[PDB]
Design a protein around this nucleic acid. Sequence first.
RNA 1: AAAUGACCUUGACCUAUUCUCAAACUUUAAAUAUGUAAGAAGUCCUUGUUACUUAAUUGAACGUGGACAUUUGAAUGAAGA
RNA 2: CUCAUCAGACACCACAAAAGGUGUUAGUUCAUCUAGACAGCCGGACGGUGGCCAUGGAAGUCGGAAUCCGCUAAGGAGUGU
RNA 3: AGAACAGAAAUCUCCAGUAGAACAAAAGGGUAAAAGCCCCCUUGAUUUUGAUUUUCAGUGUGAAUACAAACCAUGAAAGUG
RNA 4: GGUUGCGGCCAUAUCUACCAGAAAGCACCGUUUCCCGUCCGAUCAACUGUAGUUAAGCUGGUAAGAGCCUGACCGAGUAGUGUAGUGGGUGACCAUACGCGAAACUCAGGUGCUGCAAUCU
Lengths: 296, 169, 211, 159, 122
Amino acid sequence: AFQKDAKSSAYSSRFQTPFRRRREGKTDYYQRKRLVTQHKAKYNTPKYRLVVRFTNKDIICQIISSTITGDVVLAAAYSHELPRYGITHGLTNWAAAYATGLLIARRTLQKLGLDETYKGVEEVEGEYELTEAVEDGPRPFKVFLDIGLQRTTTGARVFGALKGASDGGLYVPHSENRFPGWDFETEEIDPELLRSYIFGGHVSQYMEELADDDEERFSELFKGYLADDIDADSLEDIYTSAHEAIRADPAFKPTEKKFTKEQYAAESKKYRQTKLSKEERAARVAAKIAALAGQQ
Amino acid sequence: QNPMRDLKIEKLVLNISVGESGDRLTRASKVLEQLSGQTPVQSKARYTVRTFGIRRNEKIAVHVTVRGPKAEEILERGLKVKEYQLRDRNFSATGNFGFGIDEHIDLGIKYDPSIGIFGMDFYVVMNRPGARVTRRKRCKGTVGNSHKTTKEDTVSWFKQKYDADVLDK
Amino acid sequence: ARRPARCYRYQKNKPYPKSRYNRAVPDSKIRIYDLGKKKATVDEFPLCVHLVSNELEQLSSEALEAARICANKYMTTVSGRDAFHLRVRVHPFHVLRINKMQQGMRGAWGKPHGLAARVDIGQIIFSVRTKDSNKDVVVEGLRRARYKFPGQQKIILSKKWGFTNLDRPEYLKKREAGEVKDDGAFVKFLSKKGSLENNIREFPEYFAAQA
Amino acid sequence: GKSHGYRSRTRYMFQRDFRKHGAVHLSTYLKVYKVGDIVDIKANGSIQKGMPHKFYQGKTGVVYNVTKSSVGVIINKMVGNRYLEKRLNLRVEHIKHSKCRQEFLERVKANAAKRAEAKAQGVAVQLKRQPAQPRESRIVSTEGNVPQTLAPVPYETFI
Amino acid sequence: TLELLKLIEPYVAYGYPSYSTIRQLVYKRGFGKINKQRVPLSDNAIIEANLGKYGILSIDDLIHEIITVGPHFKQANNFLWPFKLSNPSGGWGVPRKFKHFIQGGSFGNREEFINKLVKSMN
RNA sequence: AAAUGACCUUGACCUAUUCUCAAACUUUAAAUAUGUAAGAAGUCCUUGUUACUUAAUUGAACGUGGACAUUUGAAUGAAGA
RNA sequence: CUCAUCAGACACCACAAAAGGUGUUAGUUCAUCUAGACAGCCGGACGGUGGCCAUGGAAGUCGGAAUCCGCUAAGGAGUGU
RNA sequence: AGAACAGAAAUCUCCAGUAGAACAAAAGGGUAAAAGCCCCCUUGAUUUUGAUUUUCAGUGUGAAUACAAACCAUGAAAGUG
RNA sequence: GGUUGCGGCCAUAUCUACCAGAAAGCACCGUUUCCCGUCCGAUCAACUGUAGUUAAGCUGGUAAGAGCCUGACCGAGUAGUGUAGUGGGUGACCAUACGCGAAACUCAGGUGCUGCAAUCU
Ligand SMILES: [Mg+2]
Ligand SMILES: [Mg+2]
Ligand SMILES: [Mg+2]
Ligand SMILES: [Mg+2]
Ligand SMILES: [Mg+2]
Ligand SMILES: [Mg+2]
Ligand SMILES: [Mg+2]
Ligand SMILES: [Mg+2]
Ligand SMILES: [Mg+2]
Ligand SMILES: [Mg+2]
Ligand SMILES: [Mg+2]
Ligand SMILES: [Mg+2]
Ligand SMILES: [Mg+2]
Ligand SMILES: [Mg+2]
Ligand SMILES: [Mg+2]
Ligand SMILES: [Mg+2]
Ligand SMILES: [Mg+2]
Ligand SMILES: [Mg+2]
Ligand SMILES: [Mg+2]
Ligand SMILES: [Mg+2]
Ligand SMILES: [Mg+2]
Ligand SMILES: [Mg+2]
Ligand SMILES: [Mg+2]
Ligand SMILES: [Mg+2]
Ligand SMILES: [Mg+2]
Ligand SMILES: [Mg+2]
Ligand SMILES: [Mg+2]
Ligand SMILES: [Mg+2]
Ligand SMILES: [Mg+2]
Ligand SMILES: [Mg+2]
Ligand SMILES: [Mg+2]
Ligand SMILES: [Mg+2]
Ligand SMILES: [Mg+2]
Ligand SMILES: [Mg+2]
Ligand SMILES: [Mg+2]
Ligand SMILES: [Mg+2]
Ligand SMILES: [Mg+2]
Ligand SMILES: [Mg+2]
Ligand SMILES: [Mg+2]
Ligand SMILES: [Mg+2]
Ligand SMILES: [Mg+2]
Ligand SMILES: [Mg+2]
Ligand SMILES: [Mg+2]
């Protein structure tokens, strides 16, 4: 804090703090307004967002509606739930995104009742398509894609989660030009490539691109893939069979009791310092006036 | 207390301020390019003076940003020129440092009298790990005092490497 | 050419300063507002005598200057250049207009003509500080300056120490025990608020809890 | 000459509630409005579309229409010796649900409450508001309260 | 209603009437609004005929409902035509009337001194 | 001799103070004036209509049937409205 | 309370100001006084001591720094000649 | 605060920065992952007739607002026009 | 109670200087075949979760700290103001009567509260 820099009383008195979630670089309100706000003649029917976020290698997929008192989660699905369904490593890949997508698609569809109806696309050839409404019967569940502060590049994994919720059955309106294998110049899409990315083909092809020109970083990157004796030829079925596992049971059961909460409350209030008394710091400065002004 | 408070170099940026446009500039740029391997960037004039004979938006300079090992390389290739001797000036109180060298052939690259000779500003901006808070999109934050570059801390890092000398006062 | 001050004795208008908008203003006839030993220390001059307005009127910069020189002159010529601090506590920021006389009263918004200060009732006009050995002298000076002004003003002896907001006993109390710190014209005081280190370098003499 | 434009004289009226500038928080887009709600009208200087003319600032009206981004409010404006009906199409950003009836509503639920509790026991209804009555007798003690006798004070100067 | 009297202090004189003042007011200048046609009271059958529903059936019944501000004070009071008093007979006791009582005038709330004045005007 | 030199000097800038001001300055902020409400066109429940609206007989608006009377919802006035 | 050799005499209203008075009235802050104050006549102001530099020449006195004892009811190292 | 020529003013870098800038123009409002700056794609500056606000006679005109019915632009999208 | 994702109110949350932080989570962090973006894989894209660290982010605490929020017969019934008089004053202006009534000042107290979902010795 250079002496030439410190801030004046006036500066701070007249400074207007932004919204907490903006100071925390976490909410784009200019986007939130336009995602959340509903047509005023639709009065209480809420706008549902499919938020998807990326921890440093773990995928979050919530479906939220908003509320004057605070956003309420209808369904939640985390990509770290993928062990259950038969994936073990890299739950940040494009196909882990697609997986979580599908997972929450069917989790909410069943939570609602359009489980049997709107089963989505199953034979996933990687086509461009949206879960269409069914003649003489309920329209699909509609959510809009909350990618947050993600920077919308063509071929990114936020749109993989997109593709997987869509393929699961949710109606998530979307274009195609930011799906991997969208052609930059000529306005068409390669579905063999998009099916590949849905399954692993770029990670599998990285594996058997490194198993015979670098065993020396294949060694460490992909370590687990050797430690469980599974190579490129594999994956496409690891994932197809996860797909089966999810469409067969989406039901979210949670984690086992494991020192139920009051216990954690205790063993963390051990590390939570609580504030001092006004009389405490009164004396803690009368100490200092004795000790310093008092000619030692 | 450094477990990783370990002062990398963030970037080095080289800069010929070719005080007018045209051939001399498209030459200083190819100079920057067979020293950088990257395509350099031209800088337009901000405003117009006519002492320095320039015009707003006149494309009167060129620079290039090089990061990592290649930039240690061209750094050293220039500390040779300046004999591993620097000044207690030349250092930002914010931690970075730079020097200048006319006669850009002292860097290796040969003479080729269909490009001429050019001078160059060298600026080395330095940073510890986790400079990403300041420069990422989400959760953009400021690094703690203890953790950012100092002048003193970076002259000490500079003397300790290269066995170089800095200055009087 | 200057109009008789009776034409502008009263506060008939709303303040018309120099400003972005008025902005051809002539220069105030009074420019120096502190006279005598203005560098002296608050201890040097404990007595304070005000010349205080008893009217809601307007005082021309011309008569402000006239009475400044009047009073400062008498005071030095009987007391000495550095025997007193004379501060005039009234700045004439209000611009007087005039309609300069083949036309009529068509379009008759005046040009600036003078400046003037707008003084309330009980508003201090002059403030003079000395030590009590002088009082008769500064009093007589303000009394002679009084005659340069329109409308009743009265001289009054401050209960305060020179130009401080403290009465003499309370000021003694403060400085004798711990708390006054000279400064060029003026003085700073010890706060109980804020930084405790930065509060101790400043005012070290205190915190003996003694004189 | 003179100037009488649409937003004339609104300098402070439409000003921004110092240290409350910036983007509007989302609770005012989350409020819902039905036909017949009583709403207040305050302009938000930051939303230039759909804002009320200055005359309707501080004014309360009733919703008559509900559209995508805005509500239609009915206001009774006095022109001459008569009121006319005016219909403003205002955006949600300049509207506020009114508490001008909250007292009333709370006092009708309270009324029916003590009315049920009244016909439960013998009927002693007593449920109209009455103005402040004057005070009733009381006895003031001097125990530890003997009276301090005050007098007026002479002229000081203090300056 | 106190805010009303505040609103009109400089045009009225008013205070706290005694039983005697109210009794002599109703007896001598007490008229009922009966299908107006204000009617001198002059028999209790008139009072009964119109205040009867409220339990008032005499002139003293009327007076009592006035003085003990009643559950039916509003109707008892709106039933009495505004009393038409003459000027004070003694005079006003002050040289100028349109100052507050406190300033040696006549208007505002003198408090039991209303009775001297009204008795001099009744 | 110069100094990116020490030193005085007057300057402008920074710091904490100091006297005084604004119709076209202001954080604060009155008084008087000013919008709306104080029920039967009220409140509450039960569950029809539609092409609008909802993932959805979801909502929205308009309705059928049912429960609570002048202390039916403050004051004052009313040669009526 | 006011005596005017141009008194004053009732809102709007038919005018008067700064400034002055030892006319008279009431008041404020300092002081002295029956341990005798103010006024006025009368006596005393001597002395330790011409305390010292200017020395053409200053007891106090053209003048310049200065600052006290003894006797006393009191008596200036000096207000004015 | 720092970098050859380079100087008060050229280009490069970091730190601070509540807007002290910019938004054709007068001024006042308003705006910070924008309403400002750089880029990309466009013609909604379009089609049909009504209602509404200011000025008001509650005429006209100018300007503006929120819908209905089209056909479009942009964006992953909600949306926005 | 900690933590994360999404939040409502938008400083009691901001600013400055220090210090502490188990577990998990965030994080920084490794790589450049692929989609993608750059003068620069710094940002942005992707891959790994492997090789590494609490240093920073983040959370919390300390300060007769700056700012901010709250309260008070603190100042102050002051300034201002609605209403009245054939009140005072040459005037400027002023006092009184029935009401309403601040701001500064000063002092004291405080420094985020909380919704949904998941997760944690
Ligand atoms: Mg300050
Ligand atoms: Mg965006
Ligand atoms: Mg470490
Ligand atoms: Mg040139
Ligand atoms: Mg006036
Ligand atoms: Mg005027
Ligand atoms: Mg003329
Ligand atoms: Mg003529
Ligand atoms: Mg003209
Ligand atoms: Mg003109
Ligand atoms: Mg003022
Ligand atoms: Mg005078
Ligand atoms: Mg002060
Ligand atoms: Mg005008
Ligand atoms: Mg802001
Ligand atoms: Mg527009
Ligand atoms: Mg008689
Ligand atoms: Mg008689
Ligand atoms: Mg008379
Ligand atoms: Mg009689
Ligand atoms: Mg103002
Ligand atoms: Mg009213
Ligand atoms: Mg009524
Ligand atoms: Mg009636
Ligand atoms: Mg009638
Ligand atoms: Mg005469
Ligand atoms: Mg008069
Ligand atoms: Mg006089
Ligand atoms: Mg002698
Ligand atoms: Mg503008
Ligand atoms: Mg056009
Ligand atoms: Mg007009
Ligand atoms: Mg008409
Ligand atoms: Mg016409
Ligand atoms: Mg038209
Ligand atoms: Mg850990
Ligand atoms: Mg990335
Ligand atoms: Mg640490
Ligand atoms: Mg964080
Ligand atoms: Mg914190
Ligand atoms: Mg503090
Ligand atoms: Mg008043
Ligand atoms: Mg008057």
